[PDB]
Amino acid sequence: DENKQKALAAALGQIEKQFGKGSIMRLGEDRSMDVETISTGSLSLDIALGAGGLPMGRIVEIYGPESSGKTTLTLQVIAAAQREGKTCAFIDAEHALDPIYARKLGVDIDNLLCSQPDTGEQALEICDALARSGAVDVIVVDSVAALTPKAEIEGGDSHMGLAARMMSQAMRKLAGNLKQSNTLLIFINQTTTGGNALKFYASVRLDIRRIGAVKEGENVVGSETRVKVVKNKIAAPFKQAEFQILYGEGINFYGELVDLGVKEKLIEKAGAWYSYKGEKIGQGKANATAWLKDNPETAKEIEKKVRELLL
Amino acid sequence: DENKQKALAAALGQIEKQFGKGSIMRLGEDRSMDVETISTGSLSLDIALGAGGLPMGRIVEIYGPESSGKTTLTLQVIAAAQREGKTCAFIDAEHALDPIYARKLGVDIDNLLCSQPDTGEQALEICDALARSGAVDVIVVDSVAALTPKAEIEGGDSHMGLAARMMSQAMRKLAGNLKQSNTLLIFINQTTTGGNALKFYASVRLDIRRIGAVKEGENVVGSETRVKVVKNKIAAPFKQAEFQILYGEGINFYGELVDLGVKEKLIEKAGAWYSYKGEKIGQGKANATAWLKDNPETAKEIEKKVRELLL
Amino acid sequence: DENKQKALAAALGQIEKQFGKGSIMRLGEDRSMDVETISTGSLSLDIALGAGGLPMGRIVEIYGPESSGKTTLTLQVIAAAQREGKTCAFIDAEHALDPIYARKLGVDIDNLLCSQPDTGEQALEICDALARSGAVDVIVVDSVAALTPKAEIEGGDSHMGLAARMMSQAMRKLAGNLKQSNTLLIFINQTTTGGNALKFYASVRLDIRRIGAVKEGENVVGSETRVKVVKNKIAAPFKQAEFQILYGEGINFYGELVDLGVKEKLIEKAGAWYSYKGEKIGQGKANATAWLKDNPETAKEIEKKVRELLL
Amino acid sequence: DENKQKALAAALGQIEKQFGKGSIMRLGEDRSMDVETISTGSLSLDIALGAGGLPMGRIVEIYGPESSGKTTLTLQVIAAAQREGKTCAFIDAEHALDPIYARKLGVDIDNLLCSQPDTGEQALEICDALARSGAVDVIVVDSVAALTPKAEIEGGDSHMGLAARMMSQAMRKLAGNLKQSNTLLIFINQTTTGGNALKFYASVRLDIRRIGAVKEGENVVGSETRVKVVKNKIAAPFKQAEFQILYGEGINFYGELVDLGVKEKLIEKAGAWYSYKGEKIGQGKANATAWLKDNPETAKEIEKKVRELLL
Amino acid sequence: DENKQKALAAALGQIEKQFGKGSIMRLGEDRSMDVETISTGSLSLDIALGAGGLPMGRIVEIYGPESSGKTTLTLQVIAAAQREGKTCAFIDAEHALDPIYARKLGVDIDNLLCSQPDTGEQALEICDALARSGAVDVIVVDSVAALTPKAEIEGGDSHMGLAARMMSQAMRKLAGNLKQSNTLLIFINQTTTGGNALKFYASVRLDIRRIGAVKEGENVVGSETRVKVVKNKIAAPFKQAEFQILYGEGINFYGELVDLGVKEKLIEKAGAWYSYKGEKIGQGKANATAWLKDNPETAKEIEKKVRELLL
Amino acid sequence: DENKQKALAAALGQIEKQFGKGSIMRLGEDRSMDVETISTGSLSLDIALGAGGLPMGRIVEIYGPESSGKTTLTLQVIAAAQREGKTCAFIDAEHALDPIYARKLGVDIDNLLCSQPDTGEQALEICDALARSGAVDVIVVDSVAALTPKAEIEGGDSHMGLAARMMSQAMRKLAGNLKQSNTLLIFINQTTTGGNALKFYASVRLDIRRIGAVKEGENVVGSETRVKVVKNKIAAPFKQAEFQILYGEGINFYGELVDLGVKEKLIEKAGAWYSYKGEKIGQGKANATAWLKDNPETAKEIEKKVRELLL
């Protein structure tokens, strides 16, 4: 028993040593790698990620059905990054970016770098060139399924096979260059298309889905969302997050803060009343949310505490 | 910071150098490629395009639902071109051209070249032959969905797959020939039909939709229209334009000039009164519009200024 | 400029050469292919067709809503043909021919060949057999939508898809045989049903519609009609014709002659009086019309002149 | 006859001696090897296995279609093991573990070791490292088809051939190390993928399939399941088990106990009434099941007896 | 002529003498070697074999596509053997034996010896050990293609070549040992896999195929089967047999008896009525079959007679 | 010139004298050795052979791809021989004889001697024993590629080299014995396998191939066949024959007779009508063929004449 524990700890260390940090973990583990991260815009998701956000210098995949919120998430990541002075690039093969919505989410469109590549290979080569430049902090690719191989664009080989080979031939180099420059790259996808390269090179894989609607009376104002961290090499995987994505607003962060604040016993709740530091902040989640939103500095205080407690 | 900026500018230059001009841009960029362009008939759209119109020698796709204004736009382009002495050709597979409406828009029907091809392949081959002739300045294809592959016309292969292969097998050659002769080619479409060839070979892709009706009392006189530049390789993409398309008249250009003139502080507006150069031009947008329409030379003056300021 | 024109003329010639006569035309072109034609019964339509009537040896489609005049037109074509000694056949799948009305239009019912096929395929095979015989000059098929595929008649495949395949599998052969024997074939239809085969194999496609009623006081005596030549491979397309179809009489030819005679300055009109060759022919269109109708030989003189001037 | 029997018994002993225990058996044999085992969560399956569960220190393969219950079984094995204080590891290449469902099945997620390997080879090497540590009691690999060879991940060799060679090159070593440390390893699969290595090195191979649904009225609450022991080197093979897998609950163990208890004449059944030790336990299988579930200690008594009688 | 015949008979005798019994035969020959045999479960096949069944002490190969009935046949052989008190062994490398179906065919599963070898070589060595024991009467190997050579299991040599060498290196010894102990061994296969050893060492080779389905109304109840004796060293080869294999029942023996009984004029047939010994046994083959099945002793009488007449 | 001719004739005679009859020939030579022959079943082939069939006492090789007709030919030879009272033997190493098809070709299966040898060497030794018996007239070996050397059957020497040595070590003796007893031996093969022994010892070598299909409407009823006499020591080589092999019938002899009869001006052909001896035998080759087939005695008359004229 005593010897076994040491034997276990020793074997796990050897694994980590031989195959790399994160190669194996106890799912209940509280420890998490030391890496710089960018918020996803969601507090519950940042917590599910263990590290407090998406890891810099790594590859991340976010996949889910159309209208699941995949794009909202990546825009929220771009917004948070830019807010810190980071340079972001959007590699577009979907031709569907909504700048009006992006601005509402806080994205600095004017300073967002954008590329609309001629082929899937070119898209990947541009991602690699940007990764090597060491002058770009975040790259978002929309999307894997839209990265049509040159051979297909030129019109008898399997389109699936061609896409898989295209992704494979570029992944190792890209991953190395991204790591070296500490650049984060997110692939939006819809097993997912593109083969096994992304699945294995990704440090984080997120499964996002719309699980319901958010209504204010009888009017649909958004969607209830659920994100599962199906792969996580920086912390324990399989945690999930649930939050709302409101139209023209994005992720309802303060709504999350209210709930987490309560769960962490930082915010008291007597019936329909919420209180913080011996003072009512609002009656009803809607009001408590509005309060925090109106009192930014106090919200930050609670968030910092929620993070210190759960991360 | 100082070094990073240079590193960024350097990397972006290398991208442009290796993959081509327009391969990447800062969305807030004011700079735009040096290319000859033809007006779309809409001032707001010419502005959204960044270059002041559609680029000569390139492929453009305009797609949207039936009755969205797709055809009105292409006719306006033909009209503007012919007005400059350019030769235009209309490749028809829809058999729906309305010459009466076209004339009202200013199209010189008598001098418009027209082809009603026997198959989708033939349509493409004729476009290529015209592109190589170097004697045609603008080609409009109506429409991609109507370009039925010979195999389908002759009546077990996927009709979608066949159309995609038909477009793919002709695109590279067509694009090269169009570029060499500086011929503009617009594909009207309704992701769009035809596969990935057009999507990637296009230098500009326009999403057009009818967003409402225009009424003069209780009578519908036209449609409020919105065009989004979803792809743009000559200038920053994702800009949008809104204008009216009036029955028997076409795009309400002067109505746009009034609004843009005001926004650019070139035309003063006191309540319902509009003034230019210390003189009232009309009370109410309808009158201001009518004024400009009646005073052509002055309108040109304002437009030239609006263009110099926004392009 | 000088060189360009030659370059243009040269390219267009190559197109015509490579893809066939009529593959491309300047809409204002006055030139028209050299083909034998049969009158439609309408002078304005014969003029809109450019060649002076429907082309022998080709496939023609006439489509429009129920009660638009589709059948009246085909009967008028049969009448004109028979009047020249040509043999006509009516392939019927509608079972709605009105012999009383047909006779009033001048159709020689006694000598009209008629077939009421067992299936859509059989109908097409009979058309092909008649086309190969070289003993039939005009074939009218009523109608495409009624040509039910055998599979459907026998009662899970798309009825639309089946009809499209039925038409496709027979069109090439039919077109070749019709061309070889110089037989004209008209398909009456109601995009139209039957798929893309007819749309592309047709040398002429006519869109006919009833745009109003013709009244003599308060009694409806006929319909104002409009025919648009949406496809024309023998002359410039998109021209239109407007005429009246009177009950128990058919197309008001003389009414057209009056108007065209006037437009062509062949018939003078002082107020309500019409004159020809220094003599009043009638006061009021109704009288002028009646005059021409009563003076056949003179009408022919005017028509011959109108044709020489406009064709 | 008398001599033959001895000759037979002697030959079979020599086989067992020369090729190993379990090399040959009389299918009706009641005897079973002496090995430590972990329950599968199903009583009927533990019985079909002959030894009362899956054998420690051996390799086991569980294969079947998607949604057949493969994962439910392995989770049930992990749960039972952990319940005895054993350390379990989950090697994941599918990225689909549902921790909520796992907990419902009794899995101690917090203490479950998890690895999400970079390649199929790495997955196997980690399994071997864990096997040599002697500090892990159960390893589950999900799944064989997802263990993509490095060569394939890196993108012209047969993917099937590569996977087969990958499994082959690691199997002997793994099997020896697992045997030496008495570690059980289960490969989840879907002949199965991976070649012949697993098929021959496995001491037990299970074919699992969903044969129907379980309904409570009109609502589907689970699936009727059937497991066939297609290979068994610890006891006679080809026995089968049938049980229910209920959503959010897992294998319906008590439902099995009821039936087996009855079959073994340990539980009397008069019509719809079930009785044990001269007392009614419930009317209807649903109630009898609920009873046992509520009276844990008594259930154990019956199970112990069923096992002593059938194993 | 007279001398030639003697010369022929003399030469053939010398061949038989020098190369072995069965080395040459006149295909119409009625004579057959004197060897103990086990029924195949099919009367027509036992007849085609000439000796009345498969020969003890010899090697037999049964090959055909998947679902051809190969396994049904070997199970029928095992059943017949066991019914006579013979000991049978099943060497399994396919892991697909269906004990439920086997029992329905009459196989005594409880007393069936079974081995699931670790390698193809081990499988062969176990067959040899059992052959030398002289305590096993019938051995069935399922199947040749599944006997993976150790070298292949361990993962650059031709898999085909390796399998051929594996079979070759074991065949002579096996054949000698089987002959010495009078043990019958059947190899199930799918030219066939395994090289030339089996092809030449086999005394009998059977080609079995499903040639159609057996239906009772509109429900498929079995398969029409055809077996060709492509090699036969105990009697004239190239004879064939046709019979039905019914699901959950096996070979329709009585259906064969009915037909053969009729052909041999042992059973009279007047229209749809069958009679035996001056009494109707049934109207329709289905009834006649059912009769014989219900009157076992009488069936035996007919079979014994059919055999005496045709063997 | 005069002297040269004599010198030539003299030298050629010396060659024939020193090296053997047939050692050299003028390809246009009409003369042919005096040897007994058996028909091939094809009239055109018997003619191409020069001697009217295959030579008794000699070795013949017939090679071609699978399904080329090799077996059909040898069966036709066996049939013709047996029809003359000759004794035939079939040495089988392929185990693929189809007795049903053979009978249709006229083969007397009941009296056909058959051997299915244990090794390639044994096959050859049996052929030699039969050759020495002087009681067998025709021997067919199917096939050379299937005559596996004992060494190979027993499983590091070249399989090709071993087969070549096996054939070589037996050929001289076999050829001498066959010659002495006047026995014909045909080796079926697929340069061909077996080395150089057969190639040089053969008096005739036939290259047979399927060059197309024979259809009766849209149903394939047979194969168009072409046989080239690549080696011929009894008459001039390199002649070819073309005929049809119909399923379930064999070589279309009468179809050949019709054509040859016509070519030899023995059968007149006026358009589609064929006549013989001043009487129509049929309209169309199919009918003329059927006629001859129905009038055996007359066919023989024509064949005898065709042979006298061309042999």
Tokens 């849209």 map to which residue? F218
In a domain, B3, yes or no: no
**Is residue A231 less than 8 Å (CB to CB) from chain D?**
yes
Q: Does the distance separating the beta carbons of E148 and D7 come in below 8 Å? A: no
Tokens 């648009």 map to which residue? C228
Residue F268: burial class (beta carbons within 10 Å; 0-12, 13-18, 19+): middle
| Calpha distance D70→D17 (Å, rounded) | 35
Nearest chain B residue to C200, by CA? B118
**Is there a single domain that holds both residue B305 and residue B203?**
no
Decide the pairing of beta strands A37-38 and A54-55. antiparallel
In a domain, A8, yes or no: no
Identify the CATH number of the domain in which residue A274 sits.
Answer: 3.30.250.10
ω into D143 cis (within 30 of 0): yes
**Is there a single domain that holds both residue C43 and residue C153?**
yes
Q: How many domains does chain E have?
A: 2
A299 touches A293 (CB < 8 A): yes
Q: Which residues pair with F282 in a beta bridge?
A: F274
DSSP-based three-state secondary structure for B214? strand
Q: Nearest CB to F95: which of E8, E26, E231?
A: E231
Q: Does the distance separating the beta carbons of B15 and A116 come in below 8 Å? A: no
Nearest to C54 by CA among C70, C27, C73, C71: C73
Minimal C-alpha gap between A85 and chain D (Å): 33
Tokens 């046709």 map to which residue? E242
B184 touches B56 (CB < 8 A): yes
DSSP string, A227-258: EEEEEESSS----EEEEEEETTTEE-HHHHHH
| Calpha distance E292→B16 (Å, rounded) | 90
F220 touches F214 (CB < 8 A): yes
What is the side-by-side strand order in the sheet with A25-26? A25-26, D113-115, D88-92, D138-142, D184-189, D59-63, D204-216, D219-232, D240-246, D250-251
**Is there a single domain that holds both residue A237 and residue A280?**
no
**Is residue D212 less than 8 Å (CB to CB) from chain A?**
no
| Calpha distance F194→D267 (Å, rounded) | 76
C238 touches B92 (CB < 8 A): no
Tokens 């690691």 map to which residue? D170
Q: Does the distance separating the beta carbons of D152 and A230 come in below 8 Å? A: no
Q: Is E41 annotated as a binding residue?
A: no
> Amino acid letter at E142?
D
Under DSSP, the state recorded for D278 is: S
**Is there a single domain that holds both residue A112 and residue A202?**
yes
Nearest to A215 by CA among A176, A177, A235, A244: A244
Under DSSP, the state recorded for D168 is: H
Task: Give the mutation candidate from B16, B162, B200 for the A interface (greatest A CB count, under 10 A).
Answer: B200
| Calpha distance A143→A154 (Å, rounded) | 20
ω into A143 cis (within 30 of 0): yes
Angle among Cα E201, E207, E209 to the nearest 5 degrees reads 160
Decide the pairing of beta strands A113-115 and B25-26. antiparallel
- Buried (b) or exposed (e) across F272-289, using 16+ Cβ within 10 A? eebebeeeebbeebebbb
Q: Which residues pair with A60 in a beta bridge?
A: A186, A204
Query: What number of residues does chain C have?
Result: 311
Angle among Cα B213, B215, B220 to the nearest 5 degrees reads 70
In a domain, E118, yes or no: yes
Which residues, 6+ apart, have CB-to-CB distance to A6 below 8 Å?
none
**Is residue A134 less than 8 Å (CB to CB) from chain B?**
yes
A226 touches A27 (CB < 8 A): no
**Is residue B196 less than 8 Å (CB to CB) from chain A?**
yes
Chains touching E (3+ CB pairs < 8 Å): D, F
Angle among Cα D53, D54, D55 to the nearest 5 degrees reads 115
Q: Is E64 annotated as a binding residue?
A: yes
ω into E115 cis (within 30 of 0): no
- In angstroms, the first-to-last Cα distance of chain A is 30
**Is there a single domain that holds both residue C66 and residue C213?**
yes
Nearest to F299 by CA among F255, F263, F251, F243: F255
E55 touches E234 (CB < 8 A): yes
Last residue of a domain, one of F252, F270, F295: F252
Which residues, 6+ apart, have CB-to-CB distance to A226 below 8 Å?
A208, A209, A211, A240, A241, A242
**Is residue F153 less than 8 Å (CB to CB) from chain E?**
yes
DSSP-based three-state secondary structure for B142? strand
Nearest to B89 by CA among C25, C229, C203, C16: C25
How large is the C-alpha radius of gyration of chain F?
A: 21
**Is there a single domain that holds both residue B94 and residue B194?**
yes
Nearest to D45 by CA among D72, D25, D66: D72
Q: How far is CA E298 from CA B201, E42, E270, E291, F148, in A?
A: 85, 18, 20, 10, 49
E203 touches F67 (CB < 8 A): no
Residue C199 tokens, joined: 């749309």
- Resolution reading in Å: 2.0
| Calpha distance B118→C98 (Å, rounded) | 36
In a domain, E14, yes or no: no
Long-range (24+ apart) CB contacts under 8 A made by D173-177 are: D173/D128, D174/D59, D174/D124, D174/D127, D174/D128, D174/D131, D175/D59, D175/D201, D177/D128, D177/D131, D177/D132
Last residue of a domain, one of F212, F229, F252: F252
Under DSSP, the state recorded for B253 is: H
In a domain, C45, yes or no: yes
Which residues 1-20 of chain A have a CB within 8 Å of chain D?
A: 4-5, 7-8, 10-12, 14-15, 18-20
| Calpha distance C234→C48 (Å, rounded) | 11
How large is the C-alpha radius of gyration of chain D?
A: 21
Under DSSP, the state recorded for F111 is: G
Other CB atoms closer than 10 Å to residue D271's CB: what's the count?
7
Residue C135 tokens, joined: 């003993």
Angle among Cα B117, B121, B125 to the nearest 5 degrees reads 80
| Calpha distance C105→C277 (Å, rounded) | 30
**Is there a single domain that holds both residue F273 and residue F177?**
no
In a domain, E18, yes or no: no
D203 touches D58 (CB < 8 A): yes
> Amino acid letter at C188?
I
DSSP string, B178-200: HHHHT-EEEEEE---TT-HHHHH
| Calpha distance D264→E163 (Å, rounded) | 48
Residue E118 tokens, joined: 């670790």
| Calpha distance B242→B192 (Å, rounded) | 22
| Calpha distance D251→D223 (Å, rounded) | 10
| Calpha distance E242→E232 (Å, rounded) | 18
Residue A237 tokens, joined: 């995987």
Nearest to E69 by CA among E254, E242, E255: E242
| Calpha distance E37→E34 (Å, rounded) | 9
Query: Secondary structure of B39-94 in the HEC alphabet?
Result: CCCCHHHHHHCCCCCEECCCEEEEECCCCCCHHHHHHHHHHHHHHCCCCEEEEECC
Task: Give the mutation candidate from E97, E128, E153 for the D interface (greatest D CB count, under 10 A).
Answer: E153
**Is there a single domain that holds both residue E185 and residue E291?**
no
DSSP-based three-state secondary structure for F70? helix
Task: Give the mutation candidate from E88, E95, E137 for the D interface (greatest D CB count, under 10 A).
Answer: E95
Identify the CATH number of the domain in which residue B47 sits.
Answer: 3.40.50.300
- Cα atoms found within 13 Å of the Cα of residue B303, Cβ hemisphere only: 20
**Is there a single domain that holds both residue D273 and residue D189?**
no
**Backbone phi, then psi, for C163, in 5-degree steps?**
-65, -40
| Calpha distance D253→D244 (Å, rounded) | 8
Query: Secondary structure of E42-105 in the HEC alphabet?
Result: CHHHHHHCCCCCEECCCEEEEECCCCCCHHHHHHHHHHHHHHCCCCEEEEECCCCCCHHHHHHC
Residue C151 tokens, joined: 């599979």
F227 touches F53 (CB < 8 A): no
**Is there a single domain that holds both residue C274 and residue C125?**
no
Which residues, 6+ apart, have CB-to-CB distance to D24 below 8 Å?
D12, D15, D16, E89, E113, E114, E115, E126
E241 touches E259 (CB < 8 A): no
Nearest to E275 by CA among E243, E287, E251: E287
Q: Which residues pair with F212 in a beta bridge?
A: F224
| Calpha distance E96→D298 (Å, rounded) | 38
In a domain, B11, yes or no: no
Query: What number of residues does chain D have?
Result: 311
Centroid of chain to Cα C206: 7
Residues in C touching B133 (Cβ below 8 Å)? 7-8, 10-11
Domain extent at residue D298? 253-311
Q: At what angle do helices E296-310 and E285-294 cross, to 10 degrees?
A: 110
E239 touches E30 (CB < 8 A): no
DSSP-based three-state secondary structure for C141? strand
Q: Does the distance separating the beta carbons of D233 and E112 come in below 8 Å? A: no
DSSP-based three-state secondary structure for F175? helix
Tokens 């159709």 map to which residue? C107
**Is residue A209 less than 8 Å (CB to CB) from chain D?**
no
**Is there a single domain that holds both residue E129 and residue E247?**
yes
CA dihedral (E202, E204, E210, E212) in degrees, to 10, reads 160
Last residue of a domain, one of B221, B252, B283: B252
DSSP string, chain E: -HHHHHHHHHHHHHHHHHH-TTSSEETT--------EE--S-HHHHHHTSSSSEETTSEEEEE-STTSSHHHHHHHHHHHHHHTT--EEEEESS----HHHHHHTT--GGG-EEE--SSHHHHHHHHHHHHHHT--SEEEEE-GGG---HHHHT----HHHHHHHHHHHHHHHHHHHHHHHT-EEEEEE---TT-HHHHHH-SEEEEEEEEEEEEETTEEEEEEEEEEEEEESSS----EEEEEEETTTEE-HHHHHHHHHHHTTSSEEETTEEESSSSEEEESHHHHHHHHHH-HHHHHHHHHHHHHHH-
This structure was determined by X-ray
Decide the pairing of beta strands A250-251 and A240-246. antiparallel
**Is there a single domain that holds both residue B269 and residue B145?**
no
- Buried (b) or exposed (e) across F111-120, using 16+ Cβ within 10 A? ebbbbbbbbb
Query: What number of residues does chain E have?
Result: 311
| Calpha distance B193→B147 (Å, rounded) | 10
E268 touches E276 (CB < 8 A): yes
In a domain, E3, yes or no: no
Residue A25 tokens, joined: 């973990």
| Calpha distance B110→E144 (Å, rounded) | 81
